[PDB]
């Protein structure tokens, strides 16, 4: 079967450059176009590049905002098509896709990470969400756990050290000011909390930091 | 550029038909921008569905099809299924470079509505000695996943300072999503009453939360 394989996306400071790679493997793919296309959570999807596989004949198209910038590109020999990004701003981050198009999209790649950001290694400030006095009367409480000002993705938050697992709710990761935060809560029987103790351990494998806070009322 | 749009959202129920549409900036779409379809559900899966207009990729259900209605390009699921939500993009060629639209967000109903459960938390203790506080208002299992929040403080409509996470599917289907309202520590001493309202299908829930206790 047909596969593609991405590769060479990570991390890289605004002006700076990166080369992608788009490995396929099947068929003779003469007659296929590869596109690259881009997504962020801001503009889902948008088309950035694309080639002609024809050994005997090569045209490409850029997207207008890449023009001058990315260079799309193909060896044979090793069966690739390459996307080269220089001058990278904020705005061409995203997880960058290989297509096999022909007539329509008919093979995808698994997508590389290509993030262009200035901040450092930041870890996590994690602080307790606690009810107010006004949610104390409730059969269930939901506490909580902010994680906040940390980079990059992901964390990973964990209740009681995994031994809560139901009620859990991780919510997606905002961005503020090239740093992230996002939050995560427990909901148990108002009997167990806080006559037993409740504690969040989350994780920033990227800075080796574990942090753990119990949940105590306020 | 040669900007192309479609409907954000539609819902549709099992073994009905929808039709999302897809209109060029330039003028009427025709069968000369080769309009493409493409399905993209959780994980980044990608699937062609149309491509020429109206060109069936092999394997995609005969229930899909492309089309032309007047001034835009148009697909037509005929008796939806569960397995259609997702999010469909339409792509037109433009003589020299392709475009996507935003993107529809399709909802086919797999279960029945749920109400969102909402929890306000107030800034931590540790938090404000940074001189910043940061009020939480959690959501979850609502459906569809679609919820609108806006916030008060001292009974006033707050403008900036807000941000709301797009919903994520939980492992029942129904949604859960979050809500910062950031204020500096100063502006938290400054008032007494704040509030989330999470409207979801034309229904308001509240948490507020008063100082003054």
């Known amino acids: 079967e047909v596969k593609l394989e991405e590769s060479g996306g990570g991390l890289v400071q605004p002006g700076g450059s990166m080369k992608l790679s788009c490995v396929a493997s099947?068929?003779?793919?003469?007659?296929?176009?590869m596109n690259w296309v881009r997504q962020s959570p801001e503009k889902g999807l948008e088309w950035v590049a694309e080639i002609s596989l024809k050994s005997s004949n090569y045209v490409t198209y850029y997207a207008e905002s890449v023009k001058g910038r990315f260079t799309i590109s193909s060896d044979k020999s090793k069966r690739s098509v390459y996307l080269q990004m220089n001058n990278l701003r904020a705005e061409d981050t995203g997880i960058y896709f290989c297509?096999?198009?022909?007539?329509?999209?008919?093979?995808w790649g698994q997508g590389t990470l290509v993030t262009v950001s200035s901040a450092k290694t930041t870890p996590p400030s994690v602080y307790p969400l606690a009810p107010g006095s006004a949610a104390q009367t409730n059969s269930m409480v939901t506490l909580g756990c902010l994680v906040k000002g940390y980079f990059p993705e992901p964390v990973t938050v964990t209740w009681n050290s995994g031994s809560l697992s139901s009620g859990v709710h991780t919510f997606p990761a905002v961005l503020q000011s090239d740093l992230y935060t996002l939050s995560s809560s427990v909901t148990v029987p108002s009997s167990t909390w806080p006559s037993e103790t409740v504690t969040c351990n989350v994780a920033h494998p990227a800075s080796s930091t574990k942090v753990d806070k119990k949940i105590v009322p306020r | 550029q040669a900007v192309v749009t479609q409907e954000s959202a539609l819902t549709t129920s099992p073994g009905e038909t929808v039709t999302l549409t897809c209109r060029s900036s330039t003028g009427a779409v025709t069968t000369s921008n080769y309009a493409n379809w493409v399905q993209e559900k959780p994980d980044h899966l990608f699937t062609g569905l149309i491509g020429g207009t109206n060109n069936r990729a092999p394997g995609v259900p005969a229930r899909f099809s492309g089309s032309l209605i007047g001034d835009k390009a148009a697909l037509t699921i005929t008796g939806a299924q569960t397995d259609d939500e997702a999010i469909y993009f339409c792509?037109?060629?433009?003589?020299?470079?392709?475009?996507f639209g935003g993107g529809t967000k399709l909802t086919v109903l797999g279960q029945p509505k749920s109400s969102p459960s909402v929890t306000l938390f107030p800034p931590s203790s540790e938090e404000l000695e940074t001189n910043k506080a940061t009020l939480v208002c959690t959501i979850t299992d609502f459906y569809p996943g679609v919820v609108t929040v806006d916030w008060k403080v001292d009974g006033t409509p707050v403008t900036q300072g807000m941000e709301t996470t797009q919903p994520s599917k939980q492992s029942n289907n129904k949604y859960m999503a979050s809500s910062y309202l950031t204020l500096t520590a100063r502006a938290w001493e400054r008032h007494s009453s704040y509030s989330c309202q999470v409207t979801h299908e034309g229904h308001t829930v509240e948490k507020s939360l008063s100082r003054a206790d």
């Open positions: 792509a037109l060629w433009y003589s020299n470079h392709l475009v």
């Open positions: 099947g068929f003779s793919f003469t007659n296929y176009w």
């Open positions: 297509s096999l198009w022909q007539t329509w999209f008919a093979y």
